[model samples]
Target chain A: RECISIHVGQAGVQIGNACWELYCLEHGIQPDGHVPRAVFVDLEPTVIDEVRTGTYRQLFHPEQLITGKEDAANNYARGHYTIGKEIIDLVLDRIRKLADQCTGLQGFSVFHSFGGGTGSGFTSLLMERLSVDYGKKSKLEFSIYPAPQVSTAVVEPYNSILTTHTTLEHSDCAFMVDNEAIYDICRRNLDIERPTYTNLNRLIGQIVSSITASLRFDGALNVDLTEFQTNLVPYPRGHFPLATYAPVISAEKAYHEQLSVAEITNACFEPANQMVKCDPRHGKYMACCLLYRGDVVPKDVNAAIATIKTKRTIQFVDWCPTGFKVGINYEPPTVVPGGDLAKVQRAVCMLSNTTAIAEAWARLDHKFDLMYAKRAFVHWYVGEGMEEGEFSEAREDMAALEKDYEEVGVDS
Target chain B: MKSIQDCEPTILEAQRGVKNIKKQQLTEIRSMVNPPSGVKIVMEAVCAILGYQFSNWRDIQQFIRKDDFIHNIVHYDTTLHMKPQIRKYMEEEFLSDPNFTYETINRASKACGPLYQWVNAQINFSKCLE
Candidate 1:
């Protein structure tokens, strides 16, 4: 079975490039260079041109890369309805062809930012159509939540809430990243004076590969799409997982510091390393998965688990009482450009489904209500064929999701 | 030590694309059917500003559906030729006030005759860019 990747918008296309590059290096060198099962899309022609002319240009099919004449200009209405409407069918057509190439398609994993135009509106529309065409197939996302340190739009809340409400039905599971938090990791852990999107995304690419490595290579937990769904997701609505990666060290400090399995495992649970800026201590873990890379023994992993369980901070819900599932893949973590991260002997990526990410949802909900009360930008969306009433309805659904998070921890 | 804190990955002043300035501005209103020379004059201004004109109010929604409003509006801000002190004078005085007649547009058009048929009325009533 094979899995497909769909990257949409600026954030998606850039992360897609990073993911495919690392995926190849970990698999090994070849004349063909291990073409990824990926489709990259952006409304603006600019960003996609990176892959169209980069070192790995030939690694993808020409049709696999799609771009539009204009960008959404950070407007959710335009990206979702008017402009997104023009390009979505063609993007889906490309995906169908890619899906046909697979002997048995496992599912699709989408990489996108929930704050921008195509990432929000276009991605929402794309996900809606995907669920229809591949009814039984599972769809997951590596979504970028908004961060003030990397803010792009004043109207990000409109796009985020609108798309989140619409795509919630279609998306099976989602892992969200906050740029502000990732930026902190680079300055503190990686020790880069000035942080760039590339540095943050390289770390993201590693986490993505670690999760997919189980299916892509061999041995252990989360073997298929449904398997991942069953392992981490206990409830349909409570699907956002807090992803954390360990030993996010610079090459210089990496040489000085020893990267033992237990050390990296402890680092994964630390708030400093969690992808989204939320305190998991305030939330209940319905399910958790620890995916390890490189030379790891079950002995070290069990010891690491014991230490985590004894801590009063890590709380689990008693309703189902399912704790941690560990998956170990043999390939050691791959290092790119030598300066970004250490070629660590072992790495751990923790994908924990905790109610803590409800904080992000609640924060966005407050921002959305603060703006919507003024009805400041509702006209822009209404002019694009979206009814004003839908905004109110979508917000109501989001509020319910926050309440759902409250009730999920009833037994904690 | 690698001077890790002092070091930033200044990978390149690399080429992703042209470093065009971020100049996009979105309009609050996308369409208005508030007139009766019925778009002949309004579409004229839109054509000057955007390079394309829509004939029917409901129909423009469909074409702009194809073109995107920001696509059309970016042209509005980008162009130097957009001028319609005439449209504003016509609306603010005559239409929106629970106001006017042919005498109304003529009154607003009177602002145009102050410099004897030239007020840069075009410049006087024009909106500002963000």
Candidate 2:
């Protein structure tokens, strides 16, 4: 079960470091390193240098960490149509070589920001190419949707909308993590006034780590990547899943309080721990996979979720059975040195396909329509060889997605 | 003519040389940081909390050596940002003088602001084991 991670652009590359670090920790890869089943791509060299110098530097071969000559300058067209084509072959060659090394290649997990030019545009291009190249393989995406509050570029909404529209048909399942929700998590949970990228990326890494923990550690459920798509994604368009994680306990509290399976499981339902800002209780869930890591047993998991179900707090659609897929990994989570996060016995990461996620799509849809209606910034995309019709096509795809999610319980 | 087996010794020696260079690089990296007493154990403890592995000394070294890294993690000021119960533990278990000056604690807290901030949020500061 080999899964290759493709990290794109600055955010993707940085988050990839944390994700791979967690993966290595669970699999017992030494600091000197073992061959990492991951490939990193970027339009610039800045983030890759840190990866090169970090503890897991040896994990990646020089070819696997690829960078382009020129950046996309935050333009989706530049990334999708121009600079992306020039450097994609270098990335593909690396992926081909990596696939050769694997005994059974499952598929790829792409990590990138949906608003950044290279991350969004280049990632969309790669997604299209990857679909064509490997049609049967699972292509999961870990997308960072830009928060309006932290706008680095004025054209972020345009980039995000274009990327989303392009990847709708290409990607298998998209796991979204919004920067605004992450910032709120920091402020509300971590008590940080200004959460830097380091903090946000690390937090995002924890969520990614939990999702893959089952696959890497050989847990009881959803061990196969394809199972996620098969079980959660009922329709092709309704594939974007929302993720939430709990027990990001600090070092000091690890030994003092023993967190039970039930406690951690319940914490995952809390709004603050969610990756995307939405109330799962308000919306009916199509499917939910609860992945538990660290010192947990099958019996405890059974009892914990059973307790939640009896309460009738969480409602699932009538068409879906049980609606809860549970997996447990014996390996506990570890923290950085001197920071204190040891002795924590358990944590839970929940991935759910809920109609409530329509709110997120609706938010993005509203923002896109507002800008598109005014024809604001439409020329930038048009000048880059993108037809103005592409915008409408993309918006229509998102509108269809929102409608799909909305109609999940209409006839049921 | 020598077979490929005849060159095995030379190949092995080349592999060892590559390993040595890797070791040297990690050593140079570790040399940059000045870790406090009991940092290795504390680092290992942190590893357990985050479900991460701490195989290389550089792993701990990076945190300690970062500019404005935590100089003293167990003290009144450094532990102030920590949960109240954690501060109590630091005073009772580690520090002899719990009554340190506020100014000293404030300076140390600010020096390692990110660490302190992270500690407060991620850790169960209120809980301590018997």
Fraction of true contacts retained by every candidate, in order, equals 0.09, 0.00
The numbered model that scores best in TM-score is 1
**Model 1: runs farther than 4 Å from truth?**
A30-34, A148-150, A220-223, B1-130
| iRMSD of all candidate structures | 11.2, 24.8
Q: Listing every candidate in turn, what is its Cα RMSD in Å to the true structure after a full C-alpha superposition? A: 16.6, 28.9
* A164-217: candidate 2 lDDT, tens digit per residue: 766788888888988877766666655557677767777777677766655576
lDDT of model 1 at residue B18?
Answer: 15
DockQ of each: 0.05, 0.01
Model 2 regions lying over 4 Å from their true place: A53-57, A219-222, A253-256, A338-342, B1-130
Maximum-lDDT candidate: 1
TM-score of each: 0.76, 0.72
